[PDB]
Amino acid sequence: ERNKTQEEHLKEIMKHIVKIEVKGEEAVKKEAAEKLLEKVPSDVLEMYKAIGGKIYIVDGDITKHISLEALSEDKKKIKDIYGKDALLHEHYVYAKEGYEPVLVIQSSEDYVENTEKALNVYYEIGKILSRDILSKINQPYQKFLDVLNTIKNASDSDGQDLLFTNQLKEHPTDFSVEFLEQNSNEVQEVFAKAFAYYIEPQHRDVLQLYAPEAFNYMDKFNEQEINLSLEELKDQRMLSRYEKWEKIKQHYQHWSDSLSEEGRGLLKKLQIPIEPKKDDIIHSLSQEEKELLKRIQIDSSDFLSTEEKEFLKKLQIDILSEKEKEFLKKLKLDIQPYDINQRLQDTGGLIDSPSINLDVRKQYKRDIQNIDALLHQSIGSTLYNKIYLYENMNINNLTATLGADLVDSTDNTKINRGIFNEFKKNFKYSISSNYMIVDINERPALDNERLKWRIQLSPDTRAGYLENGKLILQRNIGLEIKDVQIIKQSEKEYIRIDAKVVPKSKIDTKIQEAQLNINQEWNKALGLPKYTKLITFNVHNRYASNIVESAYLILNEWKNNIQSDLIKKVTNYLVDGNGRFVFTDITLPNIAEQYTHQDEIYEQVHSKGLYVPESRSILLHGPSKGVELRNDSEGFIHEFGHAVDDYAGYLLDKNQSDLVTNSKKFIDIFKEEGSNLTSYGRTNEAEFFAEAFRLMHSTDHAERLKVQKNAPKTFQFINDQIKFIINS
């Protein structure tokens, strides 16, 4: 609480902006305004200074003062907190708006006694805050709009009565962003009004009494969130942005002047991946390979994407058979860009993962250990205290599935509130397994980047300084999420995510305890031995907590749509083989439940979900959008289909390990109905079975019906397998 400095700083701040100009009693008056302004959060006084504003404590008819003479006379008739018209040459306060803002307060000492006046002064200050300060950083916005609606659409109308004008009282629907746009003056007024009631200690109770939400809002805002407001406000100031950059630049001056050529080379290839060059791709294929290249109709594969498809296409132009699919599986590995940061993210930092050829694995490890040694100097310095860094991010990176509907379908400048709430839901902690490249001062994002992180670094956080005003951070950072809200920047809506850096171990302990909890819970629900390790969280990336919290939801859906005894028999079977329900955010090829049972590396599979018979495990990737699989639940249940196809076919030739989807009986059922369900289900036997199984146990009962009337024989089949397994 080295707050005495906050008083001394509030003292020094007053020093500049506060200009006393009275009779001669300059002491009883001067120290009177000190008591009046002390009630205000220090940080709003500094914001006012930032925008060049000044405070004058004068005597008599305030409209007389120099700064208010240039006042179009009509502006000489204001309104008090209560909305009753008054006359500036009769009032005691006024806040001149404009590019040279001014606050004029008629001296007094009874601000202590006359609560009404102080109240009014605070209201004018509240007005300065919402009309002169926050507007320069596009606030108030959605968050505050929510408070306003909470109030208008609340049981007791008293809240409205206390803070709303009839203009807002009578407004039909809630206050949209568009409303706050053409009624700016209006919202700013309510803000100031609530700010006022909150600041004047006598009225605080009334505010909390009839308008709790407004109270809680202004409470949190004046205690913590205002500091960030000041921060964002300083971020628009040129000299402020440059001063910050300079202190950081010189803190790392020695680190820089000492970086070698190899040093710089490393940081650079870490910023720009090296794309594969045709010339080499070709000179790595024996003629046999080479002609099967010119022969194979690239555009016929499946596992290959556009760029991958395209790139390959130029390999022919430069010079589905089971074997040739095996040829492409290889090329897919060799045509991937050398992207250090991508490698860390894909593996969650598990760089020994046998998901790529040994030669490149080693080159990635060599470059990574080297980068890890380069970024040895922590940010902590004597040139500054708390330090904020910024990062513009593409939401698909966290959740493609939600990223799909983030932007408003009709108006791309808007963020869809529904998806926003869902995205914000269980976002509490995050992890960085690669090197975050952040900006010293916030900068404009790319079109696909509607996520703007404001990260508070630890003085411990290690980083590297880049000449262009960015920092490369050490890998393995821990991040707690402090606030997620919609903001507007340059005619465009973004999702501001306020995060604080903490030790990665703190977050891991949270995940690790979560794993313990979820297994304790489901081992009991399923009747498994107390300590079986069934569910496993392999979490290492930026949407970390979501992977964790979605697991509970996924398994709950899983249990509420399937026969309890079907679950038990099957999961006991899985457990018997050391199976696992793996929820991860690293690509599947790096989960060993899959890779330790591969013959070749290229035989790897990455997708939304995957069932591995050898390990009897279900793997579910969080970040991606399952091939048009509504959500994670559908995907997990789909994978459970394969699980069943396994346990049923096992109860078939008991003495073996074959799938019940291989039976001639089903193959024929597929031969006829294999196209009635989904395209993905059309893929093959087991897939058709899994898709069918999935729809049958969908939450959408209409879904179930589709199978029943478009795959009747299949429907009756899956059911046969169910009773089979249940009674066996």
Ligand SMILES: O=C(O)CCN1C(=O)/C(=C\c2ccc(-c3ccc(Cl)cc3)o2)SC1=S
């Ligand atoms: O590409 C896709 O989108 C489908 C990925 N996917 C699958 O590929 C699924 C399971 C799966 C596929 C193939 C196999 C398989 C499993 C073992 C062996 Cl030896 C051979 C193939 O399991 S579940 C799922 S989703």
Ligand SMILES: [Zn+2]
């Ligand atoms: Zn499948």
